[PDB]
Amino acid sequence: VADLKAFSKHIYNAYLKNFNMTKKKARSILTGAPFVIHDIETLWQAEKGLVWGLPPYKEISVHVFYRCQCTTVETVRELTEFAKSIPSFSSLFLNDQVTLLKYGVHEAIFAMLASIVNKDGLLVANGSGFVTREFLRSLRKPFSDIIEPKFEFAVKFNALELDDSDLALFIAAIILCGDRPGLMNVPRVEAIQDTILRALEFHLQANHPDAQYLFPKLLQKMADLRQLVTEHAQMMQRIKKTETETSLHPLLQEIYK
Amino acid sequence: KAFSKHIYNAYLKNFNMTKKKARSILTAPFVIHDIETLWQAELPPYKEISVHVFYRCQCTTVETVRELTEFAKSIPSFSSLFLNDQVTLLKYGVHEAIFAMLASIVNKDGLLVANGSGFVTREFLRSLRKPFSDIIEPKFEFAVKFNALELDDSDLALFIAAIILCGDRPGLMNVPRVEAIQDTILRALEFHLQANHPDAQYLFPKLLQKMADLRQLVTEHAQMMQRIKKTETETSLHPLLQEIY
Numbered sequence: 185v186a187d188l189k190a191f192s193k194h195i196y197n198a199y200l201k202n203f204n205m206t207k208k209k210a211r212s213i214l215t216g217a218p219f220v221i222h223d224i225e226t227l228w229q230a231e232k233g234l235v236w237g238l239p240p241y242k243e244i245s246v247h248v249f250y251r252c253q254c255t256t257v258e259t260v261r262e263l264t265e266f267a268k269s270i271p272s273f274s275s276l277f278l279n280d281q282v283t284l285l286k287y288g289v290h291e292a293i294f295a296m297l298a299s300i301v302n303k304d305g306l307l308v309a310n311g312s313g314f315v316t317r318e319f320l321r322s323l324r325k326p327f328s329d330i331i332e333p334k335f336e337f338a339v340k341f342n343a344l345e346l347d348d349s350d351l352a353l354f355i356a357a358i359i360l361c362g363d364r365p366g367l368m369n370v371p372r373v374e375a376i377q378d379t380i381l382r383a384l385e386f387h388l389q390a391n392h393p394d395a396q397y398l399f400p401k402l403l404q405k406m407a408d409l410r411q412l413v414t415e416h417a418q419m420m421q422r423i424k425k426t427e428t429e430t431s432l433h434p435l436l437q438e439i440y441k
Numbered sequence: 442k443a444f445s446k447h448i449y450n451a452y453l454k455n456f457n458m459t460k461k462k463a464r465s466i467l468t469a470p471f472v473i474h475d476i477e478t479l480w481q482a483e484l485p486p487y488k489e490i491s492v493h494v495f496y497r498c499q500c501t502t503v504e505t506v507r508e509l510t511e512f513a514k515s516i517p518s519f520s521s522l523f524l525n526d527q528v529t530l531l532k533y534g535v536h537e538a539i540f541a542m543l544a545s546i547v548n549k550d551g552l553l554v555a556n557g558s559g560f561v562t563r564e565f566l567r568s569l570r571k572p573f574s575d576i577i578e579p580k581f582e583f584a585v586k587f588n589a590l591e592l593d594d595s596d597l598a599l600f601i602a603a604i605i606l607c608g609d610r611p612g613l614m615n616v617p618r619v620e621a622i623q624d625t626i627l628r629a630l631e632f633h634l635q636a637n638h639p640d641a642q643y644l645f646p647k648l649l650q651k652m653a654d655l656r657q658l659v660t661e662h663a664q665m666m667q668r669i670k671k672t673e674t675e676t677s678l679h680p681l682l683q684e685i686y
């Protein structure tokens with residue numbers, strides 16, 4: 185029990201050192217000024233300077249998809265650094281590390297997106313912008329449809345009221361996932377993931393003494409996130425298929441390969 | 442440096458028999474070179490000579506695990522590792538340290554036994570029946586070569602601390618932390634060997650090779666222990682040693 189506490193603490197310190205944006209900072213921004221991007225005009229103002237090199241200009245729905253890609257890429261690089269500070273992650277085979285990152289980053293990105301989202305939209309640009317969910321729904325298919333299911337997931341996730349300390353362990357559990365295809369040392373990964381999930385159960389009784397069923401609720405969100413990413417990867421295949429003049433960042437190319 | 446002195450202090454606190462004590466005896470102990478001497482000299486109930494010596498080996502290695510366990514508490518930052526990692530380090534390392542320290546009580550002809558009091562010849566131990574004699578002799582071969590390095594206790598105190606702090610063990614949770622502790626130990630050791638053996642040359646990387654030789658010696662050891670566990674159904678194993686195996 186005492187090793188699990190200190191393992192949780194190590195994981196929470198890796199999280200605080202590696203993510204630019206915590207849930208604690210995001211909620212203080214969201215509740216109080218970010219500049220509101222809610223239409224074409226405000227988006228252009230935001231690009232001039234009140235908020236912020238993306239493959240040469242074309243049309244709003246595609247410009248937005250490109251900003252999503254720039255953000256997602258930056259969060260992969262934070263996740264990669266976070267994982268390297270997860271105790272035994274850096275002593276796994278190099279190919280296992282890359283495999284865990286390749287198949288887990290999206291699950292982690294859509295878990296952590298909740299932190300910066302409310303029912304009305306989300307923070308961008310390290311909290312200096314706020315893009316409304318109504319504006320993102322206004323984009324043309326297939327861009328609007330690849331966006332809205334994440335808000336639907338996030339708002340439900342937020343009703344669980346996790347804090348940073350809980351998320352560090354939850355995101356650690358997503359990444360150290362013994363089920364990813366092509367792993368070399370499965371029992372080792374499985375063992376690390378079971379340590380995290382034991383530490384997570386113990387940390388939840390401590391931090392959320394009156395919640396009920398919070399731990400199995402979280403195992404289910406991990407399942408939901410897998411389904412969310414399977415659906416996302418299908419939509420991304422459809423974009424790559426039907427939107428030929430839209431490119432994808434090479435780091436994301438490798439991931440979806 | 443102070444670090445080196447502290448590890449030495451702890452080694453002197455934890456191991457009753459030092460190379461120093463052992464060297465001034467080996468230069469009178471009762472010679473045990475056959476059945477009649479063994480019996481004059483004299484655990485699980487008696488079985489036969491060979492199994493009897495095997496039990497004596499077990500009682501000694503058990504005691505030395507206890508000592509090594511207390512010793513490691515003095516290695517700085519060992520006590521701050523996960524408890525699980527502590528147990529793993531002890532589990533996979535105590536035999537490499539026990540075979541390293543065995544060189545201290547050994548010469549080409551045999552070893553000291555129940556304090557300085559007895560000498561058991563290598564001859565006799567070879568005369569035990571298979572697989573008991575095979576279990577024994579390869580430690581002697583290693584120990585004679587190790588002794589040609591001519592370490593003293595202050596050197597061995599760091600060397601045993603290095604052995605226990607191996608980042609490579611199976612199931613370690615915090616490898617980089619263990620590795621960083623061993624690094625300070627190995628840096629103290631290089632520094633110590635420069636100061637304690639100024640005219641010996643290459644002693645440091647030769648010690649690093651002895652660590653890899655020990656790892657292999659223990660692998661061959663555990664393998665031998667495993668067939669004894671199958672084929673020598675009668676003979677018992679102190680359970681402290683079952684858990685290690």
Ligand SMILES: C/C(=C\COc1ccccc1CN(C)C(=O)c1ccc(-c2ccco2)cc1)CCC(=O)O
Pocket residue numbers: 221248249251252253255256257297306307308315330331332334335420436
């Ligand atoms: C379209 C891809 C993912 C989908 O991204 C989604 C999906 C649902 C909600 C939020 C995101 C993106 N996100 C985490 C952001 O923080 C974000 C960043 C910037 C903007 C934006 C809008 C106008 C100007 O700036 C909007 C969102 C490809 C990327 C991939 O699959 O890796």
Ligand SMILES: C/C(=C\COc1ccccc1CN(C)C(=O)c1ccc(-c2ccco2)cc1)CCC(=O)O
Pocket residue numbers: 473494495497498499501502503543552554561576577578580581666682
């Ligand atoms: C056979 C096991 C270990 C290996 O033992 C070895 C192997 C090679 C050299 C020296 C030892 C033992 N040793 C460190 C002693 O100090 C010792 C103690 C007593 C006697 C003895 C002989 C007649 C009466 O008393 C002889 C040796 C199983 C136990 C285990 O695996 O931990």
